[PDB]
From a paper:
Methylenetetrahydrofolate dehydrogenase/cyclohydrolase 2 (MTHFD2) is a bifunctional metabolic enzyme found in mitochondria, exhibiting both dehydrogenase and cyclohydrolase catalytic activities. In one-carbon metabolism, MTHFD2 converts 5, 10-methylene tetrahydrofolate (5,10-CH2-THF) to 10-formyl tetrahydrofolate (10-CHO-THF) in mitochondria, thereby regulating the production of NADH, purines, and pyrimidines. An isozyme, methylenetetrahydrofolate dehydrogenase, cyclohydrolase and formyltetrahydrofolate synthetase 1 ([name]), performs similar catalytic reactions to MTHFD2, albeit localized in the cytoplasm rather than the mitochondrion. The key distinction between these two proteins lie in their expression profiles: [name] is typically expressed in normal cells while MTHFD2 is abundantly expressed in immortal, embryonic, and cancer cells, but absent in adult normal cells.
In comparison with the structure of [name]/16e, the structure of [name]/16g revealed that the 1H-tetrazole moiety shifted toward β strand h1 and was hydrogen bonded with Tyr240. These structural changes facilitated an interaction network that increased the binding affinity of 16g with [name]. As a result, 16g demonstrated potent inhibitory effects on [name], hence exhibiting reduced selectivity toward MTHFD2. The superimposition of [name]/16g and MTHFD2/16g revealed that the triaminopyrimidine headgroup, urea linker, and central phenyl ring of compound 16g aligned well in both structures. These hydrophobic residue replacements in [name] prevented the formation of hydrogen bonds with the amide or 1H-tetrazole moiety of 16g.
Numbering used by the authors:
A (entry chain B): 3 to 242, 251 to 296
B (entry chain A): 3 to 241, 251 to 296
Amino acid sequence: PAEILNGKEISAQIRARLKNQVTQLKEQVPGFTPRLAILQVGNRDDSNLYINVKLKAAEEIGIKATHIKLPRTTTESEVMKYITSLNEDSTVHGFLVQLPLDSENSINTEEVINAIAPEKDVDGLTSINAGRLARGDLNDCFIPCTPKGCLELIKETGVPIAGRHAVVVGRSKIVGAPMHDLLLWNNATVTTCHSKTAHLDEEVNKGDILVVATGQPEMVKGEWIKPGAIVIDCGINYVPKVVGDVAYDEAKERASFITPVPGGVGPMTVAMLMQSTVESAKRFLE
Amino acid sequence: PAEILNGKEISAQIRARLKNQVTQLKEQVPGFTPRLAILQVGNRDDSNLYINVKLKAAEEIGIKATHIKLPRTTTESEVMKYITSLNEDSTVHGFLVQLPLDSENSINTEEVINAIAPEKDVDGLTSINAGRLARGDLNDCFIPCTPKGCLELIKETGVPIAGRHAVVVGRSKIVGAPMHDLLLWNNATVTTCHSKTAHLDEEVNKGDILVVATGQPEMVKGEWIKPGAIVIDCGINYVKVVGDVAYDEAKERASFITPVPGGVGPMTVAMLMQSTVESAKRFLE
Ligand SMILES: NC(=O)c1ccc[n+]([C@@H]2O[C@H](COP(=O)([O-])OP(=O)(O)OC[C@H]3O[C@@H](n4cnc5c(N)ncnc54)[C@H](OP(=O)(O)O)[C@@H]3O)[C@@H](O)[C@H]2O)c1
Ligand SMILES: NC(=O)c1ccc[n+]([C@@H]2O[C@H](COP(=O)([O-])OP(=O)(O)OC[C@H]3O[C@@H](n4cnc5c(N)ncnc54)[C@H](OP(=O)(O)O)[C@@H]3O)[C@@H](O)[C@H]2O)c1
Ligand SMILES: Nc1nc(N)c(NC(=O)Nc2ccc(C(=O)N[C@@H](CCc3nnn[nH]3)C(=O)O)cc2Cl)c(=O)[nH]1
Ligand SMILES: Nc1nc(N)c(NC(=O)Nc2ccc(C(=O)N[C@@H](CCc3nnn[nH]3)C(=O)O)cc2Cl)c(=O)[nH]1
């Protein structure tokens, strides 16, 4: 049986560290707090929940986090007025737009995301930041939070990455594609799969490291896992109960390490957002 | 044995179609011509070779091509002066900095490259253009010219790319990394290799589509090639000129294969010409 990567536990350690950093930062420079702003369009149930989790992690740490919720009938111009405003407000060190937008009108997600100043793009979602990570310039940029938490979960096994074959399943802007670059520049040989991959099961079996962000409940079967694989599950799926993208029961019999859902990648994502936010508050002082 | 992919023939076709497009644009827009500029630093011989090749091609198509060659000792602040003038000059549609910079002073290639206006980065080397391609927004940007020509060559086989396993060997900013992005948003399943990969031979053998950009002459033996594979060799290695793949034994197993030279090479030059014509057309509107 595989060792559980206790995400709920591991993130607590990160947030406690982040708190001591923030508390020390207000005692070293008095009258200064990290300031985060999350922008939301519409009223998605899952978005409302994830936003609240992040607000809570920010309260516990010492981060002043605002939440702005625009209605569904919001126009793309209206959302730019908020982005413009947050870019130019020097008290705001990082901000993010929760995705996907829930708007009845037609909003160019890319145009909006890309109006964020790269030095506040704590979610690593601008083309500017994506281009650095996509080209290996990893200390110049914000790296998306879920890949960030995923990488830390991998290192917690102590198995070196470099020289190992990693299979990423899914190529999305927020998880799969940045996940691919992080593994590649940690010198894994990486294979990206997506919805058009033939013989997905044969590919998955090649993975020493296996990261799954498909949004397809328990679609990756345990028989597919390479024996002894490190298995990272990003899935959050609400079913007749919360499951992930990997069939957790069968896969734990073949993995050497596995993330549970919930309690795995989830808390790790929120912690790395908190970390990135602190990191941009420091860079602001310099 | 494998059908040979002819870059000389296919690129000569492309340059010709470019030519006629420029001719018709000049007819409709009297006195308007596409304008490229090639910045160089240092006096590397190979760079002078390839820069001439591009200048000739642009003169063939009717693209006005200027070549500025800064000395091996320039300062970073110097190249920024030129880069800024090129950015501000409205009669220049695109421009590029031949790489690698040959300088005595340590000069940040990244800061140099990222001062280029994205609207003129016909080489697709700016971080803004790299992140558009690397996240699937392919209309937004200039794709780098070599991956553009390898994609054109693969499509000359007529076998759709989707659902196929592609193995990209090499991860450089100029060939390897953008090649993975292009194949992935052509819906291939893509495996990316590099100098830390273990068992290169077994990864290569997975490749329905195989693109090699190592700069390690003939290092990919042809006994690793998956039988029937489409093989793209980006190498140019003086020893004569050979590629990154063992051409002889590869040709026996491939279904298609590019010769070194006259494979990717002329396609690279032709794709930069096409991107330049692209910049000019957009400029008019
Ligand atoms: N903290 C976290 O746990 C976290 C954070 C955010 C999201 N996630 C989770 O990750 C999952 C995916 O989110 P996302 O942002 O990546 O969503 P998405 O935009 O729907 O991405 C899904 C990806 O999976 C691929 N895919 C879909 N069906 C597939 C199949 N049958 N076989 C192979 N590949 C398939 C898609 O390929 P195509 O591009 O061809 O469609 C796409 O790249 C969700 O469960 C989400 O909750 C992780
Ligand atoms: N028009 C054309 O045909 C054209 C265009 C451009 C380039 N080229 C040719 O392409 C070749 C590569 O150029 P480049 O820009 O990619 O140069 P580079 O910066 O040296 O890139 C070489 C790449 O090969 C990878 N690699 C994989 N296996 C390797 C091994 N066993 N030994 C060494 N490297 C290995 C390296 O991975 P690491 O990152 O770990 O080093 C690296 O990413 C050269 O021969 C060049 O002349 C020609
Ligand atoms: N800009 C932008 N837009 C986006 N959409 C995202 N993605 C995102 O926020 N993801 C996200 C964040 C936190 C959790 C979490 O806290 N997970 C816990 C508890 C879940 C649970 N549910 N029921 N019981 N527990 C667990 O999984 O254990 C889960 C997820 Cl998916 C983004 O990151 N940036
Ligand atoms: N910004 C920037 N910087 C860069 N360094 C590059 N790279 C680049 O230009 N490469 C390049 C360009 C053209 C050729 C070519 O014309 N090949 C011919 C003849 C070769 C030959 N040599 N000796 N004998 N034959 C053939 O292969 O047929 C070959 C190469 Cl490597 C870039 O693209 N953009």
